[PDB]
């Protein structure tokens, strides 16, 4: 398969990430005022990465060659697990912590002491830990970040088998790379997909958290971020 250019995907990943990557630590999360308030800080991040996720979408093969409404749909049913896979991968660079796109690190301790240790732990164990142990590259990332994008089962899809057709072309392009660049291990391609159920559940658990801080917490939520969460 050449219809889904692996080169154009690894290139789309490269475009997203900031050219200037500096990292500062975050305060324990005892106070919502400080520049560093764990939860608050994640929300500022996800809002920013919301915009760039859009452009990451575009740069993906055939995504712009879809209806206006098939694009919005796929984002509504993916931005969650898509942004999660982003920082999940980025944070393989460090142990017991999370690298945020604002240029801020977040330690496992700031998590627990902010209430969100349960899920923070789950991301490192099911995502950050796994991608690392398996040495999953940036190309492979974009191929999963893409497969999630093109989710056939998204409800309200004007053309279901259309989105299911692209998610077949990424399956090909990717298995190629996994049997090409990584021929030593057979089931490498399969190992890369095995993390999808875990990310689905994690994505769901993360929505929950987001809904609580909105409808209860004093967590200052922003525009674009806001728009992406609308489902009881």
């Amino acid at each position: 398969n050449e219809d889904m250019p692996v080169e154009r995907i690894l290139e789309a990943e490269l475009a997203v990430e900031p050219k200037t990557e500096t990292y500062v630590e975050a305060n324990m999360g005892l106070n919502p005022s400080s520049p560093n308030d764990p939860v608050t800080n994640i929300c500022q991040a996800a809002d920013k990465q919301l915009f760039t996720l859009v452009e990451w979408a575009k740069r993906i093969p055939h995504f712009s060659e879809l209806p206006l409404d098939d694009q919005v749909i796929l984002l509504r049913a993916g931005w969650n697990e898509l942004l999660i896979a982003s920082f999940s991968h980025r944070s393989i660079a460090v142990k017991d912590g999370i690298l945020l796109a604002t240029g801020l690190h977040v330690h496992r301790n700031s998590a627990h002491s902010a209430g969100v240790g349960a899920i923070f732990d789950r991301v490192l164990t099911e995502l950050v830990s796994k991608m690392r142990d398996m040495q999953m590259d940036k190309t492979e990332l974009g191929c999963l970040r893409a497969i999630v994008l093109f989710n056939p089962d998204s409800k309200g899809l004007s053309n279901p088998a259309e989105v299911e057709a692209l998610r077949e072309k990424v399956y090909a392009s990717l298995e190629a790379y996994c049997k090409h660049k990584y021929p030593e291990q057979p089931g490498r391609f399969a190992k890369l997909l095995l993390r999808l159920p875990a990310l689905r559940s994690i994505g769901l658990k993360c929505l929950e958290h987001l809904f609580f801080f909105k409808l209860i917490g004093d967590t200052p939520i922003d525009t674009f971020l806001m728009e992406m969460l609308e489902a009881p």
Partner: peptide
Amino acid sequence: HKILHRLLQE
């Protein structure tokens, strides 16, 4: 959805 429609266009 105001915000998203704009990015996907321009």
